[PDB]
Homo-oligomer: A and B are copies of this chain.
């Protein structure tokens, strides 16, 4: 089993000399196929000048990852890893690695070239390789971005602008990052506008409805660990069809946000090549 690509565009030797440096890469493929166009390669087919982040990962979640192997005349010899076997995956480069790190895929967010970014353009077309990042950096950058979708609604406060100035600088082993602002041109992204409502809606409905369901379980007794919780539910203080539809309006907002939460690992770091030019990893997913 090997997956092939074809370049209908002519390949200048200067571009294939950068392409040979990609002995391996975590190239997404939307649909597994015996043969596929280069237009299907990368996240560039999903590129949007509007939605930005979140939609890039909600479409990336279904992508079939595949490593690069070898290159021939106007064609790529991609090879799909088997689960559990070791593979010499290339890094996307933002973060230096050390032994034992977890890894997971994230949408690209360039801040100039990354440590491993030889640009390759074939007439308007461009290849945006997905991030391979340690898991704690992914959960933290997701928290910073959802927090950016909260505070961006009211930019004007100097304490808030200093707040965004403080949270913008994530750090790691000799890292010096600066978080991109999703909310370009003042107006909120539609993805930030939806992801924030996905949590804030439950933040209101759970606060209003939590009493009625703990109520019937309060008179019942067992370990009675639940009965005490309502005393702190009271600290921050009637229709039938409204009670019906409202719960259906609850989980529909809760559920798509779970993709923003859970993030299955795809690789794990072991031995590290010098200057982090490559790293062996155990494929997963």
Contacts and interface: CB of A to CB of B under 8 A. Distances in A.
A223 to B, nearest CB: 10
Interface string A242-285: 11101111110011011001100000001100000000000110
Among A154, A206, A254, A255, find the residue whose CB has the most chain B CB atoms closer than 10 A: A206
A226 B151 contact: no
Measured as residues with beta carbon below 8 angstroms from the partner, the interface class of chain A is: 35 or more
Contacts of A49: none
A167 interface: yes
Given A226-B197, A240-B167, A233 B82 contact: no
Nearest to A85: B83
A176 interface: no
Contact of A139 (B213, B255, B257, B261): B255
B262 A166 contact: no
Nearest to A271: B32
Nearest to A136: B255
Among A82, A217, A271, find the residue whose CB has the most chain B CB atoms closer than 10 A: A217
Contacts of A62: 100
Contact of A201 (B85, B150, B229, B258): B229
A235 interface: yes
A231 to B, nearest CB: 8
A31 B101 CA distance: 12
Contact of A207 (B166, B203, B230, B254): B203
A254 B192 CA distance: 16
A207 B213 CA distance: 14
Contacts of A205: 232-233
A270 B249 CA distance: 30
Nearest to A143: B251
A251 B202 CA distance: 13
Contacts of A163: 239-241, 244
A9 interface: no
Nearest to A80: B282
A221 to B, nearest CB: 9
A153 interface: yes
Given A202-B202, A204-B236, 5 more contacts: A163-B241, A197-B217, A199-B206, A208-B235, A251-B258
